[PDB]
Design a binder for these strands. Structure first.
Length: 52
DNA sequence: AGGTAGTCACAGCTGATTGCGCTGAGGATTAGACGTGCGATATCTATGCCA
């Protein structure tokens, strides 16, 4: 479990008063969902998985 | 006594006025999780088959 870690978006990290370091690799590329993003993904499902 | 400049009484030009339109700030406003229900599915052992 100590090797299992929780993650947040860069915007959510900033909300948590955290700034991602330069060049940091994405620990998890996952589904992205925001108002404009959600509507765009509903427009076409091919990029719903491709957002990451 | 004589005529055109100073003074007063009216005219054109233009700015302020009064209906009415438009932006900028300001205060109102179901998607992964978490489970289970159902269904396909590994799973353990009785016990009598005949060599």
């Amino acid at each position: 479990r100590d090797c299992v870690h929780t993650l947040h978006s860069r915007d959510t990290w900033l909300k948590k008063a955290r700034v991602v370091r330069l060049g940091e690799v994405p620990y998890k590329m996952v589904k992205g969902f925001s108002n404009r993003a959600r509507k765009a993904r509903l427009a076409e499902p091919q990029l719903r998985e491709e957002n990451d």
